[PDB]
Amino acid sequence: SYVRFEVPEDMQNEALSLLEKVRESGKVKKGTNSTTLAVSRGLAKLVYIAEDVDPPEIVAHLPLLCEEKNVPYIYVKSKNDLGRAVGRVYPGASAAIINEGELRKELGSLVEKIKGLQK
Amino acid sequence: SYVRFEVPEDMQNEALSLLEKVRESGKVKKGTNSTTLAVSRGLAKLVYIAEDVDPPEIVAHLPLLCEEKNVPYIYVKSKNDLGRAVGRVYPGASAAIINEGELRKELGSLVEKIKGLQK
Ligand code: NA
Ligand code: NA
Ligand code: NA
Ligand code: NA
Ligand code: NA
C-alpha cells in the first residue's frame, strides 16, 4: 500500500544493474534510516524501495518524503535483489545513491526515464 | 542524550492537555503523513508519538527526522490518550502542533521543559 506507480520490469533491472555498478565508483546509503536521512539532506540522487518489505510500514514514509524533496525514486520487486545489488547476501529494504562516481550520464538517463513514467 | 522513553508522566500529560486545547484556537496535524510533511517543512513546533502504536515501524522515522530538523518531540505512553487529544475516533500514531493559537504560554513552557531533557 506504499507502491505509488508501476515501474516496468526492464527499468527495474536496468536500475538494479546501475546500483551494482555505482558501488565501486560512488557512494550508496543502505537501509531505511540512512536513505531517509539522505533524502532529508537533499543528497539522495536516486532512491530504491523494495515492494516486499516486511513490515511494509517501515518504508511507507519514503515515497512521500521523496516527492516532497523532489528526489527521484524507483520501486524494485524484490528486497533480495536490492540487497544483492548493494553488495550483501541478505535483503535490503531501501537504498540511496549519494555519489554516482563515473556513472553520471547513465544515472542521468535513468532518472530522466523514471521521470517520464506515468504517475 | 534525550532519553525519550523516560519523559516524566506529568510532562506527557501536560503535553496531551495542550494538544487537546490547541485544536480549538490553533492548528494541528492529526496523522503520521501530515506530521511528517510538517517536520520536513520546519513547520512542526512540537511532535507527538505514541509509544504503543502497532506497528512501531510506522512512526520509526519521526524521531530521526525531528532530531535532524531540530523539532521538539515527545513520546506519550498511550495511543488512546493521543487519539482523544486530537479528537480521533481511532488510536493516534503521531501528531504535531503547527500553531498554538492563544496557548503561547503553554506551548512555550512545555517546549522549554522538553529541551531541558536534552544534552
Ligand atoms: Na523485461
Ligand atoms: Na535494510
Ligand atoms: Na546523508
Ligand atoms: Na505542513
Ligand atoms: Na525532511
Curated annotation (Swiss-Prot), chains A, B:
HAMAP family associated with the record: Ribosomal_eL8
Subunit and partners: Part of the 50S ribosomal subunit. Probably part of the RNase P complex.
Name the record gives this protein: Large ribosomal subunit protein eL8
Organism of this sequence: Archaeoglobus fulgidus (strain ATCC 49558 / DSM 4304 / JCM 9628 / NBRC 100126 / VC-16)
InterPro entries: eL8/uL1-like, Ribosomal_eL30-like_sf, Ribosomal_eL8-like_CS, Ribosomal_eL8/eL30/eS12/Gad45, Ribosomal_eL8/Nhp2, Ribosomal_eL8_arc
Taxonomic lineage from the root: Archaea, Methanobacteriati, Methanobacteriota, Archaeoglobi, Archaeoglobales
Gene field: rpl7ae
Subcellular location(s) of the protein: Cytoplasm
Coiled-coil segments: none
Family from the record: Belongs to the eukaryotic ribosomal protein eL8 family.
The keyword Nucleus is annotated on this UniProt entry: no
